[PDB]
């Protein structure tokens, strides 16, 4: 009941939106995605790291809303990210992250994923986090595919980390999704 | 203030329980990369920037710890507009190279870069390595990375002290193209810098494909 | 000493003549068994006429001699010319009060027209030793009875030539660390003269 | 040092073994592992040697600084923050110590209990039931725990609890003291686990 | 064996269109003391087999009692031991494969690295690699030590795939072994100027060249 | 201490059909980052139609394999000829693996070929000797990409029992072709041999060669 | 004449070592509430398990400046340090801002570190006694 | 290589010359830093004219002389007097089959009437070299040079004993482990002849 | 310090009638390399002191600095520095010990034996000894090193006790401190043929002999 | 596993505990440390795994051997030298395992019992009692044993070293079998301890 540590990211571009997705323990709280307005960020690794960088980047968000009069951008807030990471060089967070959101002047979707120490991987197809199951990142090879709708893209994260989850720990397990428009999010759980 | 040393015990206990070359020519210098990167035998990215601009003519290559890279070539950069902008000229690469040299001496080793630097400033063209504990290097043609030996195969079969630009951007695009065929490290593309004394510098993504 | 650092594998010699002195050495820099550079320069100018070659950890020499080098601008500054015993003495105190955190030795060659040509030791620990001349390196080793048989005081240039240019071929020959051209200056009251040497050249000697 | 926790409906039970240090034989009649932070907020920890007495008093000492500067009181909620904050600090330059507190409160505010865990580095859980130190009664309470239980349900599968406890250890162990948190307060089960 | 005092440091191999070349250099060192100028790595074995061995000289010189011992066995009461029954480079590559493998399972291994060069009776070129692990390979251009992570990628630009074969004029392949040869001197710290080379060919033969020098080094650039 | 053991990374992939089988893996040898060879085969035809692969320390594959063809050759001389079927051959190599229990080979093995009644079968090794039949098996560095493909396509999505050789050959070289522009160390070319009635067959394809 | 800072380690302890933090119950023991570092960190924690480049990056400006020091010393005489030192101090005691951290200008111009950036510029960073009066304390003396 | 073994650091020479073959040696045998002979002879005879000198565990290198020495009475019993090579092979075979066990290593000069005086070298590990002249031991890392350059082929036997002498007396001044007097083996057709040269001789050359 | 890099190998000295004797030899070894000769270890302060360091060679510089910079100091603004308060070898010895106490204490210390001898101004010989642990101890016959265990057996037969001190005549420890450096240029591996020595005479004063050689050396019964 | 022996006036009693190996939960009601060596004298073992059981049963073989070729029975005293000879040469080749034994008998040709304990070095040591694994029954021993007490007082007095054994050790901790060697062979208490 106490132990969450772990758990794993899957971060995915469609046309015109993001999708952001992680696993949740069993019933009888503790979610790994969070949001700064209109940017995500989910947290693998140890639960304790995941709580203080949250706590960290709400301080760090609510400052710079209050100062610049206007919400953070996705590439804005992955500097951020970066900076702070590596501020703590030799004693590093024991984190994955991974960022994604839809820039409102631009409309562009984007999606990042870190290191420990702050390094940037900007990729424009799928970002996975965590170590729990090894053949994730082969199923989300398999099953992306570019420039699809958010149904569509829903529809593939959602079908892989079902895979993911069959062939791995089970009895408890759900998900979070998170569809990112330019103007409408919706959050959906996976008790499957 | 600096670096944070929080959590250093903490996580010891826990604990407990590429193709990079630089090239000289007549009239500057080349520098070129290749642009895949990955996350060990995965390839994260097939189409990587690994060319990073210290000043507009000022650009290097780097080799280890990402972000130590990064953040050096970031913080270094910053350091020579401030520079440039206090005494009205244009940045010099030996000032470059001596903030980069005393900078990773002062952590003795600890900030795992190693570095290509190539630049044009008013004194002419100028092509350093520098090592992580802070230990700088001249010379005409450099290689660096994991495909470093057989671009330096290449670089020393084809060199010659007069080079035009474009036998100078062949022979880095050949050593970068050699490094990406023979080594498991590399293999996607090729990214060029040229930079010229008197003109402006000239970025090439994606040259070869 | 650091784990994964540059170290100097080079071969140093620095003789006293009539005229003044000469300081020579090979351009081989290595990374175990790599060859990392092989027209590197280690002659390092710390004043118009006072030179030094290093060895030992690359970064720590680089360091000190950038230290004593502005260190005797600002000599300059006040005094005019320093004599090389000056110079020794900087980089002594430098290499003995950082002893346990840097690995660091220095030889020194200078001329003045008080003294007229002199050679400094400093090996690892930070000693000094002056001399009529000093041999250094991983390849200093192999010719240390060669020197000792054919070094004499008060030779004239050509001769001090030759016999840096044999001693360098035989360390080169023998130790791995060691190879390229052979690098020398000079020191003189007419000024400081650079010359260089091929494989080809003393090769055959 | 074992300690248990569990949620019912309207109220927090917290059972913590009154046991003593070792090579050291010793008679005493009190609780030495449960600080009451506030008056409807109680703490109870397990761990090494006096490095967790130190934590626990300094809380505290802390708590009940801010009672009497505001004439208020902390919810549940704010007091495991603090407390979190607290721990994580304490190992950001010293070798982490073995530390594990239950916090049980009745918010008042919200007009409920709460229960938090947090571990030695830092984890702070919300959970309907919770232990520490126990090498399963876990399947116990998975199968006997309902989320509108009464006091007396939960200490009967508090009972149920100790007795599988107590199937696999010696004579030494003496006994489990048996705190509740409700609206009325914080009161001690003077009878039986 | 268990460490390695006399080493040799690379041999070079590949294929042309009518048989293979190799190389090597005539050094022996002693760490980093360049000790013994003279020592022959390319071991000539029949009229068409040529043997390259780097690593520690006097398990070297333990295989050429091997392959000596191999060749007067061959020719025991053989009347045809030189016209039909000579050794194939297939039967002495798998005679030396087997004794690495069966020394590296008795944890007393043969600090070797082995390229076995040579010509088929039925005109095919031979060409393959073995170790001291035993581990076995071959490919139409071959290196050992540094040589495989400076000399292969030369050479693969002359010769990349199997069809470049015939296409590889015995002039080409030679002129490619002498330049990654002289690349090798640049950048190699325990290597030689002299060294040995050795075409096998199906029409001319063996052809042995000693005394071979690196030439045409440019040591000009260095002035300034 | 001598270390003898090596590493020499390659990727396998044997399969089932309802009347055939295939076992395919990737011709790169590599050492490190160094490429030793691009085309250095690892599935070999063992005679009575069975073919046998040994991934991993080449060296100790390359012994197996050895000793498993010599025995089948004292196994035709000693018994007229018989044929072996796929299950004795299961067990003569499970023996050769736990023959070196205390010194083991550093190998996964797969062998494929026709049963008794003329079905495909494959069998999977550990490095010790444990073996079981299976219908498709994955081996080697790249097998957690190969393997979601390959589920992502057949269902065990027409079922694999009503596909036919070229469409199970199809299948193995897009898996393969989608693992070489993921892993570095998977490249250069990919041979696959075919077991049917009639024998065995060859087919080589070319790979990406970065 | 030194580069990498020597002489870090310490040589005494004692449980008063920290005058600004002593109890006013047993001035002779420090007050745990007030230090506010959890509670559970008792000094001797502090005297091992360091990471050992932290001494040399923390002493490592003012390493630097003493050996500036010490060369103006030996070439210009003693007053030349004497007048940097005096100057320093100076521009150092008469600064007073309690709300602030970061340096002065002129201390800034000072070090020649007008057109300089380094990690502790970009990184320059409770209940009880976090306030101006602790400052204003610590400042005066009192 | 044995804990708190005898270890050999010696200063070995031998050269072949018109005539035929000298062998030439220091006589310091230490441990650690005492000298515990210094007088020590290291010119071992195996045979009328062929003699060896050794270098690594003293221990091994006598039991492996001893029966190079016995296995060439025997074949002396059979086929007469035996060539410098076939020694040369027994020290080898000896060596290198027991490298695992033993550190070991020989110079062998000799002299017969076909071959007319040669010199082979057996370095740790096993092999061996035939050479014109040949060093070994902790001082001859400090005459590779010199050596180098004052060799020449079918000197007189003077012009081969100051050579030798020079080359030692180096190696004597430069190395702590080498000392004492000077011993030579000169091996022709005339017979053995035996020299000794005293401290204050060779130190004033 | 932490490490000896170069160093001297032995000091010896002895009590006679009128003051006393010390020598040491010229040569500063780098391992097992005879590195530097005309290294002087025998350093005078005043006009009645000498001190003897065996050791490493740039502690030996420093602790010469400092010997340097207590004359300097003493002298100062002293009119009679030079008559009545010059410095005293206890003075001296004091210092020195003092320091190489505290620097053993540090964790960080100087990888030297001294041995401090001379007059002291009421006519009193004064004879002591340090090393880097600071230990201190005073005897009629003193050596450091390998001298510790063969000089001094062959000086305790000249001045066995205190009662032998004004029996000694000058020419029979010096005879004795000749002999003991002939031994030890016998038996030690890191000594030299040239050493100094420094006689200290209440009557005479300081006398200063250098470039001498040990001679009558006994290489004859080598020859069989 | 623990062992224990109290050797009274005309009998000698052994007291084995019936545990079982650790990680399989075992349900059996037999005595498997203890082997029969000769109808008038009885072995009790305790320490590590198979090896014990191996000596054991080879003991065991032997003196059954020797039973059957004189169709005499040895005496205690020659028994127990027999087997400390066995142990000393068991461990004179190989790294030493954990055993202890206790031999009782009656010995008929003197008519009197005995009791005999060796360690794994293969030290025999006649005693009146002994015991093994007990981490005191030593103090218990020593005030309430005579020389002449009868069975019934040697039954109650390890009857009070078990229920001090049991005061310490947790429930899984079943129970100790124990028999009885005197004039009339061996037989075992079916009653309790």
Same mark, same amino acid.
């Given at each position: 009941?106490?132990?969450?540590?772990?758990?794993?990211?899957?971060?995915?571009?469609?046309?015109?939106?993001?999708?952001?997705?992680?696993?949740?323990?069993?019933?009888?709280?503790?979610?790994?995605?969070?949001?700064?307005?209109?940017?995500?960020?989910?947290?693998?690794?140890?639960?304790?790291?995941?709580?203080?960088?949250?706590?960290?980047?709400?301080?760090?968000?609510?400052?710079?809303?209050?100062?610049?009069?206007?919400?953070?951008?996705?590439?804005?807030?992955?500097?951020?990210?970066?900076?702070?990471?590596?501020?703590?060089?030799?004693?590093?967070?024991?984190? #994955?992250?991974?960022?994604?959101?839809?820039?409102?002047?631009?409309?562009?979707?984007?999606?990042?994923?870190?290191?420990?120490?702050?390094?940037?991987?900007?990729?424009?197809?799928?970002?996975?986090?965590?170590?729990?199951?090894?053949?994730?990142?082969?199923?989300?090879?398999?099953?992306?595919?570019?420039?699809?709708?958010?149904?569509?893209?829903?529809?593939?994260?959602?079908?892989?980390?079902?895979?993911?989850?069959?062939?791995?720990?089970?009895?408890?397990?759900?998900?979070?999704?998170?569809?990112?428009?330019?103007?409408?999010?919706?959050?959906?759980?996976?008790?499957? | 203030?600096?670096?944070?040393?929080?959590?250093?015990?903490?996580?010891?206990?826990?604990?407990?329980?590429?193709?990079?070359?630089?090239?000289?020519?007549?009239?500057?210098?080349?520098?070129?990369?290749?642009?895949?990167?990955?996350?060990?035998?995965?390839?994260?990215?097939?189409?990587?920037?690994?060319?990073?601009? *210290?000043?507009?003519?000022?650009?290097?290559?780097?080799?280890?710890?990402?972000?130590?890279?990064?953040?050096?070539?970031?913080?270094?950069?910053?350091?020579?507009?401030?520079?440039?902008?206090?005494?009205?000229?244009?940045?010099?690469?030996?000032?470059?190279?001596?903030?980069?040299?005393?900078?990773?001496?002062?952590?003795?080793?600890?900030?795992?870069?190693?570095?290509?630097?190539?630049?044009?400033?008013?004194?002419?063209?100028?092509?350093?390595?520098?090592?992580?504990?802070?230990?700088?290097?001249?010379?005409?043609?450099?290689?660096?990375?994991?495909?470093?030996?057989?671009?330096?195969?290449?670089?020393?079969?084809?060199?010659?002290?007069?080079?035009?630009?474009?036998?100078? *951007?062949?022979?880095? !695009?050949?050593?970068?193209?050699?490094?990406?065929?023979?080594?498991?490290?590399?293999?996607?593309?090729?990214?060029?810098?040229?930079?010229?004394?008197?003109?402006?510098?000239?970025?090439?993504?994606?040259?070869?494909? | 000493?650091?784990?994964?650092?540059?170290?100097? #594998?080079?071969?140093?010699?620095?003789?006293?003549?009539?005229?003044?002195?000469?300081?020579?050495?090979?351009?081989?820099?290595?990374?175990?068994?790599?060859?990392?550079?092989?027209?590197?320069?280690?002659?390092?100018?710390?004043?118009?006429?006072?030179?030094?070659?290093?060895?030992?950890?690359?970064?720590?020499?680089?360091?000190?001699?950038?230290?004593?080098?502005?260190?005797?601008?600002?000599?300059?500054?006040?005094?005019?010319?320093?004599?090389?015993?000056?110079?020794?003495?900087?980089?002594?105190?430098?290499?003995?009060?950082?002893?346990?955190?840097?690995?660091?030795?220095? *030889?020194?060659?200078?001329?003045?027209?008080?003294?007229?040509?002199?050679?400094?030791?400093?090996?690892?620990?930070?000693?000094?030793?002056?001399?009529?001349?000093?041999?250094?390196?991983?390849?200093?080793?192999?010719?240390?009875?060669?020197?000792?048989?054919?070094?004499?005081?008060?030779?004239?240039?050509?001769?001090?030539?030759?016999?840096?240019?044999?001693?360098?071929?035989?360390?080169?020959?023998?130790?791995?660390?060691?190879?390229?051209?052979?690098?020398?200056?000079?020191?003189?009251?007419?000024?400081?003269?650079?010359?260089?040497?091929?494989?080809?050249?003393?090769?055959?000697? | 040092?074992?300690?248990?926790?569990?949620?019912?409906?309207?109220?927090?039970?917290?059972?913590?073994?009154?046991?003593?240090?070792?090579?050291?034989?010793?008679?005493?009649?009190?609780?030495?592992?449960?600080?009451?932070?506030?008056?409807?907020?109680?703490?109870?920890?397990?761990?090494?040697?006096?490095?967790?007495?130190?934590?626990?008093?300094?809380?505290?000492?802390?708590?009940?600084?801010?009672?009497?500067?505001?004439?208020?009181?902390?919810?549940?909620?704010?007091?495991?923050?603090?407390?979190?904050?607290?721990?994580?600090?304490?190992?950001?330059?010293?070798?982490?110590?073995?530390?594990?507190?239950?916090?049980?409160?009745?918010?008042?505010?919200?007009?409920?209990?709460?229960?938090?865990?947090?571990?030695?580095?830092?984890?702070?859980?919300?959970?309907?039931?919770?232990?520490?130190?126990?090498?399963?009664?876990?399947?116990? +309470?998975?199968?006997?725990?309902?989320?509108?239980?009464?006091?007396?349900?939960?200490?009967?599968?508090?009972?149920?609890?100790?007795?599988?406890?107590?199937?696999?250890?010696?004579?030494?162990?003496?006994?489990?003291?048996?705190?509740?948190?409700?609206?009325?307060?914080?009161?001690?089960?003077?009878?039986?686990? | 064996?268990?460490?390695?005092?006399?080493?040799?440091?690379?041999?070079?191999?590949?294929?042309?269109?009518?048989?293979?070349?190799?190389?090597?250099?005539?050094?022996?060192?002693?760490?980093?003391?360049?000790?013994?100028?003279?020592?022959?790595?390319?071991?000539?074995?029949?009229?068409?087999?040529?043997?390259?061995?780097?690593?520690?000289?006097?398990?070297?010189?333990?295989?050429?009692?091997?392959?000596?011992?191999?060749?007067?066995?061959?020719?025991?009461?053989?009347?045809?031991?030189?016209?039909?029954?000579?050794?194939?480079?297939?039967?002495?590559?798998?005679?030396?494969?087997?004794?690495?493998?069966?020394?590296?399972?008795?944890?007393?291994?043969?600090?070797?690295?082995?390229?076995?060069?040579?010509?088929?009776?039925?005109?095919?070129?031979?060409?393959?690699?073995?170790?001291?692990?035993?581990?076995?390979?071959? !490919?139409?251009? +071959?290196?050992?030590?540094?040589?495989?992570?400076?000399?292969?990628?030369?050479?693969?630009?002359?010769?990349?795939?199997?069809?470049?074969?015939?296409?590889?004029?015995?002039?080409?392949?030679?002129?490619?072994?002498?330049?990654?040869?002289?690349?090798?001197?640049?950048?190699?710290?325990?290597?030689?100027?002299?060294?040995? +080379?050795?075409?096998?060919?199906?029409?001319?033969?063996?052809?042995?060249?000693?005394?071979?020098?690196?030439?045409?080094?440019?040591?000009?650039?260095?002035?300034? | 201490?001598?270390?003898?053991?090596?590493?020499?990374?390659?990727?396998?992939?044997?399969?089932?059909?309802?009347?055939?089988?295939?076992?395919?893996?990737?011709?790169?040898?590599?050492?490190?980052?160094?490429?030793?060879?691009?085309?250095?085969?690892?599935?070999?035809?063992?005679?009575?139609?069975?073919?046998?692969?040994?991934?991993?320390?080449?060296?100790?594959?390359?012994?197996?394999?050895?000793?498993?063809?010599? !025995?089948?050759?004292?196994?035709?001389?000693?018994?007229?000829?018989?044929?072996?079927?796929?299950?004795?051959?299961?067990?003569?190599?499970?023996?050769?693996?736990?023959?070196?229990?205390?010194?083991?080979?550093?190998?996964?093995?797969?062998?494929?070929?026709?049963?008794?009644?003329?079905?495909?079968?494959?069998?999977?090794?550990?490095?010790?000797?444990?073996?079981?039949?299976?219908?498709?098996?994955?081996?080697?560095?790249?097998?957690?990409?190969?393997?979601?493909?390959?589920?992502?396509?057949?269902?065990?999505?027409?079922?694999?029992?009503?596909?036919?050789?070229?469409?199970?050959?199809?299948?193995?070289?897009?898996?393969?072709? !989608?693992?070489?522009?993921?892993?570095?160390?998977?490249?250069?070319?990919?041979?696959?041999? *075919?077991?049917?009635?009639?024998?065995?067959?060859?087919?080589?394809?070319?790979?990406?060669?970065? | 004449?030194?580069?990498?800072?020597?002489?870090?380690?310490?040589?005494?302890?004692?449980?008063?070592?920290?005058?600004?933090?002593?109890?006013?119950?047993?001035?002779?023991?420090?007050?745990?509430?007030?230090?506010?570092?959890?509670?559970?960190?008792?000094?001797?924690?502090? +005297?091992?398990?360091?990471?050992?480049?932290?001494?040399?990056?923390?002493?490592?400006?003012?390493?630097?400046?003493?050996?500036?020091?010490?060369?103006?010393?030996?070439?210009?005489?003693?007053?030349?340090?004497?007048?940097?030192?005096?100057?320093?101090?100076?521009?150092?005691?008469?600064?007073?801002?309690?709300?602030?951290?970061?340096?002065?200008?002129?201390?800034?111009?000072?070090?020649?570190?007008?057109?300089?950036?380094?990690?502790?510029?970009?990184?320059?960073?409770?209940?009880?006694?976090?306030?101006?009066?602790?400052?204003?304390?610590?400042?005066?003396?009192?």
């Amino acid at each position: 009941p106490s132990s969450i540590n772990g758990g794993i990211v899957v971060a995915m571009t469609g046309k015109d939106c993001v999708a952001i997705a992680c696993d949740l323990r069993l019933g009888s709280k503790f979610e790994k995605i969070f949001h700064y307005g209109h940017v995500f960020l989910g947290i693998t690794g140890l639960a304790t790291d995941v709580t203080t960088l949250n706590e960290m980047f709400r301080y760090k968000t609510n400052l710079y809303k209050l100062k610049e009069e206007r919400a953070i951008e996705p590439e804005t807030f992955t500097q951020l990210v970066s900076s702070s990471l590596y501020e703590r060089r030799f004693g590093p967070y024991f984190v #994955g992250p991974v960022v994604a959101g839809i820039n409102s002047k631009s409309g562009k979707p984007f999606i990042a994923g870190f290191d420990l120490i702050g390094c940037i991987d900007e990729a424009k197809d799928f970002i996975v986090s965590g170590t729990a199951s090894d053949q994730l990142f082969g199923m989300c090879e398999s099953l992306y595919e570019p420039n699809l709708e958010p149904e569509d893209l829903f529809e593939t994260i959602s079908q892989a980390l079902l895979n993911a989850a069959d062939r791995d720990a089970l009895s408890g397990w759900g998900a979070v999704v998170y569809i990112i428009k330019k103007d409408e999010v919706v959050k959906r759980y996976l008790k499957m | 203030a600096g670096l944070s040393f929080d959590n250093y015990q903490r996580n010891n206990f826990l604990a407990e329980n590429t193709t990079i070359v630089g090239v000289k020519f007549n009239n500057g210098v080349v520098i070129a990369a290749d642009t895949r990167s990955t996350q060990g035998p995965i390839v994260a990215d097939k189409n990587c920037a690994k060319l990073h601009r *210290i000043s507009p003519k000022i650009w290097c290559a780097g080799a280890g710890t990402a972000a130590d890279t990064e953040a050096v070539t970031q913080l270094i950069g910053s350091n020579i507009e401030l520079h440039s902008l206090y005494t009205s000229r244009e940045p010099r690469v030996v000032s470059a190279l001596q903030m980069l040299k005393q900078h990773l001496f002062k952590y003795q080793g600890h900030i795992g870069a190693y570095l290509i630097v190539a630049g044009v400033d008013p004194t002419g063209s100028h092509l350093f390595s520098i090592h992580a504990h802070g230990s700088t290097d001249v010379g005409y043609y450099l290689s660096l990375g994991s495909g470093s030996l057989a671009a330096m195969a290449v670089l020393e079969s084809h060199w010659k002290q007069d080079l035009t630009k474009e036998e100078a *951007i062949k022979l880095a !695009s050949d050593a970068i193209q050699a490094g990406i065929w023979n080594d498991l490290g590399s293999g996607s593309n090729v990214d060029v810098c040229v930079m010229e004394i008197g003109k402006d510098a000239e970025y090439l993504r994606n040259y070869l494909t | 000493l650091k784990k994964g650092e540059v170290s100097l #594998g080079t071969s140093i010699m620095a003789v006293t003549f009539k005229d003044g002195v000469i300081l020579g050495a090979d351009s081989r820099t290595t990374t175990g068994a790599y060859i990392a550079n092989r027209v590197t320069d280690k002659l390092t100018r710390v004043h118009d006429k006072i030179w030094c070659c290093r060895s030992g950890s690359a970064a720590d020499t680089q360091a000190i001699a950038d230290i004593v080098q502005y260190h005797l601008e600002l000599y300059t500054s006040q005094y005019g010319t320093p004599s090389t015993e000056t110079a020794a003495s900087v980089f002594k105190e430098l290499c003995y009060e950082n002893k346990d955190n840097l690995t660091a030795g220095i *030889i020194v060659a200078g001329y003045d027209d008080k003294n007229k040509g002199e050679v400094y030791t400093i090996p690892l620990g930070g000693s000094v030793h002056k001399l009529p001349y000093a041999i250094a390196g991983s390849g200093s080793t192999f010719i240390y009875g060669y020197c000792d048989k054919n070094f004499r005081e008060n030779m004239s240039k050509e001769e001090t030539v030759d016999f840096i240019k044999h001693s360098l071929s035989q360390a080169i020959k023998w130790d791995g660390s060691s190879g390229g051209v052979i690098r020398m200056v000079v020191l003189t009251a007419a000024g400081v003269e650079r010359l260089i040497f091929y494989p080809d050249e003393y090769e055959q000697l | 040092d074992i300690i248990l926790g569990i949620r019912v409906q309207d109220s927090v039970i917290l059972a913590s073994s009154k046991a003593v240090t070792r090579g050291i034989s010793v008679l005493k009649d009190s609780d030495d592992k449960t600080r009451q932070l506030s008056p409807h907020t109680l703490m109870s920890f397990a761990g090494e040697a006096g490095d967790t007495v130190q934590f626990a008093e300094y809380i505290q000492a802390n708590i009940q600084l801010y009672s009497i500067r505001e004439d208020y009181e902390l919810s549940p909620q704010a007091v495991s923050s603090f407390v979190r904050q607290e721990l994580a600090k304490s190992i950001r330059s010293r070798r982490p110590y073995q530390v594990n507190v239950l916090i049980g409160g009745y918010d008042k505010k919200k007009n409920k209990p709460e229960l938090y865990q947090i571990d030695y580095l830092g984890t702070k859980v919300e959970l309907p039931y919770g232990a520490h130190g126990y090498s399963y009664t876990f399947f116990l +309470l998975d199968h006997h725990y309902r989320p509108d239980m009464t006091t007396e349900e939960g200490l009967d599968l508090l009972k149920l609890c100790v007795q599988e406890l107590e199937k696999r250890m010696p004579m030494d162990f003496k006994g489990v003291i048996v705190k509740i948190v409700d609206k009325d307060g914080i009161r001690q089960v003077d009878d039986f686990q | 064996t268990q460490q390695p005092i006399v080493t040799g440091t690379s041999v070079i191999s590949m294929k042309y269109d009518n048989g293979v070349i190799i190389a090597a250099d005539n050094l022996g060192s002693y760490g980093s003391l360049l000790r013994f100028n003279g020592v022959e790595r390319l071991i000539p074995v029949g009229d068409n087999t040529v043997v390259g061995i780097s690593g520690d000289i006097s398990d070297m010189q333990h295989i050429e009692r091997l392959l000596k011992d191999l060749v007067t066995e061959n020719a025991y009461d053989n009347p045809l031991a030189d016209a039909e029954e000579a050794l194939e480079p297939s039967y002495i590559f798998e005679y030396l494969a087997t004794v690495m493998y069966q020394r590296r399972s008795k944890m007393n291994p043969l600090w070797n690295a082995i390229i076995v060069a040579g010509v088929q009776s039925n005109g095919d070129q031979f060409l393959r690699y073995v170790n001291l692990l035993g581990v076995t390979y071959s !490919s139409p251009t +071959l290196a050992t030590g540094f040589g495989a992570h400076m000399a292969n990628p030369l050479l693969r630009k002359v010769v990349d795939r199997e069809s470049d074969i015939p296409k590889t004029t015995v002039q080409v392949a030679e002129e490619a072994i002498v330049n990654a040869m002289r690349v090798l001197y640049y950048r190699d710290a325990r290597s030689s100027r002299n060294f040995s +080379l050795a075409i096998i060919d199906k029409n001319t033969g063996l052809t042995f060249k000693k005394n071979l020098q690196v030439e045409n080094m440019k040591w000009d650039f260095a002035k300034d | 201490q001598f270390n003898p053991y090596g590493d020499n990374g390659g990727t396998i992939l044997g399969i089932a059909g309802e009347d055939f089988a295939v076992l395919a893996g990737d011709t790169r040898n590599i050492t490190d980052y160094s490429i030793n060879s691009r085309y250095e085969p690892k599935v070999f035809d063992c005679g009575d139609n069975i073919v046998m692969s040994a991934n991993g320390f080449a060296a100790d594959g390359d012994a197996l394999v050895k000793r498993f063809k010599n !025995s089948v050759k004292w196994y035709h001389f000693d018994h007229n000829d018989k044929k072996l079927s796929i299950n004795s051959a299961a067990r003569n190599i499970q023996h050769l693996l736990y023959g070196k229990r205390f010194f083991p080979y550093y190998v996964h093995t797969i062998i494929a070929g026709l049963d008794e009644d003329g079905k495909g079968a494959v069998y999977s090794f550990d490095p010790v000797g444990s073996y079981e039949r299976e219908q498709c098996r994955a081996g080697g560095a790249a097998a957690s990409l190969i393997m979601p493909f390959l589920d992502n396509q057949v269902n065990f999505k027409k079922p694999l029992k009503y596909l036919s050789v070229e469409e199970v050959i199809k299948l193995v070289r897009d898996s393969f072709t !989608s693992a070489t522009e993921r892993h570095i160390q998977v490249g250069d070319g990919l041979e696959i041999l *075919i077991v049917t009635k009639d024998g065995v067959r060859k087919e080589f394809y070319e790979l990406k060669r970065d | 004449m030194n580069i990498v800072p020597q002489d870090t380690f310490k040589s005494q302890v004692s449980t008063d070592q920290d005058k600004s933090v002593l109890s006013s119950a047993v001035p002779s023991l420090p007050d745990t509430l007030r230090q506010q570092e959890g509670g559970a960190v008792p000094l001797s924690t502090q +005297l091992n398990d360091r990471h050992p480049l932290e001494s040399t990056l923390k002493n490592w400006e003012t390493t630097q400046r003493q050996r500036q020091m010490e060369q103006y010393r030996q070439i210009f005489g003693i007053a030349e340090p004497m007048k940097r030192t005096m100057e320093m101090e100076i521009v150092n005691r008469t600064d007073f801002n309690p709300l602030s951290t970061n340096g002065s200008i002129h201390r800034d111009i000072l070090l020649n570190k007008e057109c300089s950036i380094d990690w502790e510029d970009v990184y320059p960073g409770t209940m009880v006694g976090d306030d101006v009066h602790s400052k204003i304390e610590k400042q005066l003396g009192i």
